[PDB]
Ligand SMILES: Nc1nc(N)c2nc(-c3cccc(Br)c3)c(N)nc2n1
């Protein structure tokens with residue numbers, strides 16, 4: 001009967017974050033389910049309050065979850081957020097690990113916008129992946145949310161817009177599977193890299209699997225990833241997916257991406273395929 005002070009009662013583990021796990025909770029006074037993250041106050045480097053600050057800076061942004069509470073309670077730092085629906089990875093598995101082109105396109109629009117909004121707030125995410133996108137609940141079930149800012153970093157000063165310096169010899173942050181080529185080469189991550197990863201995420205959804213899945217280990221993925229040309233990776237799928245990747249890989253370190261161009265590629269393709277813009281995803285068809 002584990003209780004976060006007076007207000008919340010803890011439940012089962014529902015998730016795994018970059019720093020610590022996510023538990024199902026109840027707000028007793030409200031009669032309402034929530035998602036709860038805990039950090040031991042003794043933790044060597046504490047980021048829970050740091051990560052909450054980012055969320056609250058982002059608040060009001062479309063597809064950004066809302067923080068109900070952040071603070072210290074007993075021997076824990078606590079973050080409580082609004083409860084959201086399943087991740088895209090979860091839903092991928094329920095859809096036999098293949099999304100229809102319509103679903104991938106509907107996702108890509110929203111996912112590109114999420115990344116664009118975070119960039120507008122002077123942050124890069126650095127762990128763009130299917131697990132870090134979640135569907136909303138009820139009336140927001142059609143909305144893709146972005147979560148987990150634990151690896152997120154500020155890429156430019158807010159007032160001056162001074163961009164962070166180019167560096168090399170960096171250790172990889174994020175999942176190797178969706179990491180950009182430059183990230184595998186130890187380059188400092190920037191806006192291009194969030195977008196490049198999103199490209200691998202979309203192709204993952206088209207294919208069911210990437211050529212560098214299921215093969216020392218990090219050098220082996222990097223190799224296969226650098227050995228596989230974009231045309232090879234995207235063969236049998238609309239050229240837009242290769243065009244997206246080639247554009248992202250063209251971008252220099254401090255370049256601003258053209259988010260409208262990339263959205264438009266997929267919007268035009270959507271039109272040519274004749275799909276209804278009805279937000280009816282594959283999982284709604286189940
Ligand atoms: N079904 C559901 N709902 C949520 N709201 C949710 N929230 C998160 C999340 C991520 C980072 C920090 C915190 Br607090 C929660 C998560 N990983 N999984 C989740 N799963």
Ligand SMILES: [Zn+2]
Pocket residue numbers: 048049052070071
């Ligand atoms: Zn706090």
